[PDB]
Design a protein around this ligand. Structure first.
Ligand code: HEM
Ligand code: HEM
Ligand SMILES: CNCc1cc(OCc2ccc3ccc(N)nc3c2)ccc1Cl
Ligand SMILES: CNCc1cc(OCc2ccc3ccc(N)nc3c2)ccc1Cl
Ligand SMILES: C[C@H](O)[C@H](O)[C@H]1CNc2nc(N)[nH]c(=O)c2N1
Ligand SMILES: C[C@H](O)[C@H](O)[C@H]1CNc2nc(N)[nH]c(=O)c2N1
Ligand SMILES: [Zn+2]
Lengths: 407, 411
């Protein structure tokens, strides 16, 4: 019941006590593990608030203090009165940072406490949302010196007044299906790229068209907004050895800013909370260029390299896949844009792990997502046993707006 | 209760109904997932239900469920349990359990071949020499001059646990590893402990970087004995690279037969503590794990040095670059000597087909994603985007404590 994890490369053993403060469920049972599955009222609300405020006041060395119990009462009362409650600013920040801290699938959590939190809870319209988002993008980009950020729109009320950013990331390239059969732009975004046009977006029908923002305030019909191009830092992709690479016409954007998750604090639900950090190299090169259901340029790169694409056993995909990721990292670093390689990130995470076990008694971690999609076993996370469980505050998935929105 | 796994690359959804036949525990709960953790004497009391379960399965598969043959066999097994406290498996039954133990191995990416497994019944074996003999014939048959064949040799089942047969080796064929006084390691670092054991058991170690370890065989719970596999039975492949001519000069070679010999085979409540089995290598086992892992031969750097890589910052991906070349070489050498091998793209492609087939014809295929995904180039193999369900089915291959930790020394 006080669980142990072993690193099989270093023999190091940590003891996880933090898991006993877990609350939500995993999907697994004693009969069947689901680790590889991608997606598994007033009386409900107060125990949740107490749990949060209890952990909040503990973290500031004021557990069971006057201030603590005061607030606990203050919140208890407001719930009885208003059927919800509002977070103090200090609690908001704490909640945000800890949702990142508890994000078991995020390899990048070593930075967790450095989160810049933008309180956008006064926002009332899509135009308002657009402004807050532009400000978030500008601050995070910082001319290439990326800083982590989250902007938080009003919490859910009765579920009919949901704030939502429909885009999955603030910045992503359009994908359009083609007359011949294939796909131009970015296949992952094809459906959304449609929904945008269905809302009256005029697509330049290019390969790298920055998608418009589709913002929904107070449960209203969502509106389209174009991010000022001067706020979208892009990197042209070239290889440091191969000069034909540039002719592939590749670039990628500097700012990964996930916008579709729900942020849960003290039982309050923030359905619009776009957050951002910086890219790990493989995210763009392994996943975004080379996945079959994506840019799938592997073929082309290997052809330009004149590799024996005849049998799998030449490992030409592997060879190509490496060069591509070499280029991505090369390009970003050349343009002074923050990026991290998978070796650096995973090492950083193993250190963050030792820290968390040491000063918190554990660190929920999801090995299926922490191990990079290339060169897995030569990164330190591979031989690292991990324990996965759900702590609060948390980022949760939520249904896509176009499947819910009452028009 | 039905469960759906989706494939996120192809949107193909499958439905698992087989997980309901699962009995054993996973280690997971609703509050904690342990899917990334590596590790998890029996009385007549629990034996017959375990036996009945198995025999039911068997007779179902041969389409004789409820038959007189089935009922008599249950009765027959029953009486033998109440009289002898255990029971013997018919040969048909032994073969079935063997194949299914493999078939149920949720970590095995190579299960597409499961029904084609040569089962050698060593249940008449009584001594270590007897074991050496059976094992030698296994290696010879399985190797087959390089055209590898799956096989397993099953030694006497456990009785009171005081008379176990065990192969003390983790695989039948493995290179020695020697710790040096300067803290460096000569040979395969994976095997240092086992090497010391052998040496202490009287093994004259040549102390080279590729010495094939002796077998250490225990029969009937007696102290284990050393035997040397005849070199002519040990097929080895010198590793060269198809474009880099300096790669041969690294002096590397690897053996062709992966034969794991330290697992326990469970069938019908019976426990076969010595059941060495073998198939053929997936390139990445040797090329990523066996050479490049930091706690193995660690030639990663030396290969990168000779490729004149920018080994200063990791951002050059020199490690990844050297890794791929080392796997290219491994596949190249094995194909060049006509020794059976499979690359990780081929293996995972086949597993996906196997898996899909299993869902249709069997209603599921237990699979451990953490182990099925290859140790390099993960997301460019089809398994990466395949959701999987992991659960435990018997017959099964189980882990078991190293015999040196649990053995009682006669002397
Ligand atoms: C600063 C550098 C950061 C890096 C390098 C990083 C890296 C990653 C990576 C590689 C993944 C796997 C995602 C995939 O492969 O699709 C991930 C997931 C995730 N990241 Fe981080 N991240 C960073 C910052 C942040 C920040 C600022 C937040 C939130 C405040 C965050 C929260 C999350 C969450 C919640 C997930 C998983 C979402 C899910 O469950 O699907 N990360 N991250
Ligand atoms: C014939 C070609 C085969 C291939 C290509 C293959 C491939 C693999 C690979 C790559 C692993 C990963 C192990 C690791 O990386 O540590 C594995 C695991 C495993 N294989 Fe197979 N295998 C084959 C045959 C067999 C046979 C003949 C058996 C049994 C009769 C078997 C049973 C198992 C079991 C039980 C595991 C899990 C190891 C564990 O639980 O620790 N495989 N297989
Ligand atoms: C629908 N599947 C859920 C899903 C969520 C995902 O979230 C990815 C994610 C989330 C936050 C990030 C923060 C920084 C960063 N560099 N990457 C980040 C990546 C990614 C893939 C999938 Cl498949
Ligand atoms: C306790 N760790 C379990 C473990 C099992 C292992 O078994 C590997 C294994 C087992 C069966 C195999 C069958 C065929 C094959 N080519 N490789 C095979 C490889 C290897 C490493 C570890 Cl760490
Ligand atoms: C901690 C971790 O689960 C462990 O090192 C596993 C990870 N996945 C693996 N997968 C395979 N195929 N072989 C292995 O040895 C391992 N090691
Ligand atoms: C099927 C599998 O669970 C799914 O593809 C996961 C695997 N691991 C992943 N890991 C990361 N970091 N990102 C991903 O999108 C995925 N996809
Ligand atoms: Zn699990």
């Amino acid at each position: 019941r006080f669980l142990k994890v072993k690193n099989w490369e270093t023999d190091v053993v940590l003891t996880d006590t933090l898991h006993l403060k877990s609350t939500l469920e995993t999907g697994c049972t004693e009969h069947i593990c689901m680790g590889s599955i991608v997606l598994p009222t007033k009386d409900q609300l107060f125990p949740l608030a107490k749990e949060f405020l209890d952990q909040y006041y503990s973290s500031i060395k004021r557990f069971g203090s006057k201030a603590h119990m005061d607030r606990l009462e203050e919140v208890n009362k407001e719930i009885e009165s208003t059927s919800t409650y509002q977070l103090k600013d200090t609690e908001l920040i704490y909640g945000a940072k800890h949702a990142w801290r508890n994000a078991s699938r995020c390899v990048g959590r070593i930075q967790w406490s450095k989160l810049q939190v933008f309180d956008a809870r006064d926002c009332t319209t899509a135009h308002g949302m657009f402004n807050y988002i532009c400000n978030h993008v500008k601050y995070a980009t910082n001319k290439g010196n990326l800083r982590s950020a989250i902007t938080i729109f009003p919490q859910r009320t009765d579920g009919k007044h949901d704030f939502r950013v429909w885009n999955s990331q603030l910045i992503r390239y359009a994908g359009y299906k083609q007359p011949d059969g294939s796909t131009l732009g970015d296949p992952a975004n094809v459906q959304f790229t449609e929904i945008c046009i269905q809302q009256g977006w005029k697509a330049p029908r290019g390969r790298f068209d920055v998608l418009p923002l589709l913002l929904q305030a107070n449960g209203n019909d969502p509106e389209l907004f174009q991010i000022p191009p001067e706020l979208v830092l892009e990197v042209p992709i070239r290889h440091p050895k191969f000069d034909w690479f540039k002719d592939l016409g590749l670039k990628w954007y500097g700012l990964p800013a996930v916008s579709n998750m729900l942020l849960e604090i003290g039982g309050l639900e923030f359905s619009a909370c776009p957050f951002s950090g910086w890219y790990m190299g493989t995210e763009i090169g392994v996943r975004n260029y080379c996945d079959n259901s994506r840019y799938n340029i592997l073929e082309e790169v290997a052809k330009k390299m004149d590799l024996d694409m005849r049998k799998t056993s030449s490992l030409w995909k592997d060879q190509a896949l490496v060069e591509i990721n070499i280029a991505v990292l090369y390009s970003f670093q050349s343009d002074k844009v923050t990026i991290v390689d998978h070796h650096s990130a995973t090492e950083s995470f193993i250190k963050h792990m030792e820290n968390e076990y040491r000063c918190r008694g554990g660190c929920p971690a999801d090995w299926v997502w922490i191990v990079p999609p290339m060169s897995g076993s030569i990164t330190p996370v591979f031989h690292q046993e991990m324990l996965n469980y759900r702590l609060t505050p948390s980022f949760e998935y939520q249904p896509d707006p176009w499947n819910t929105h009452v028009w």
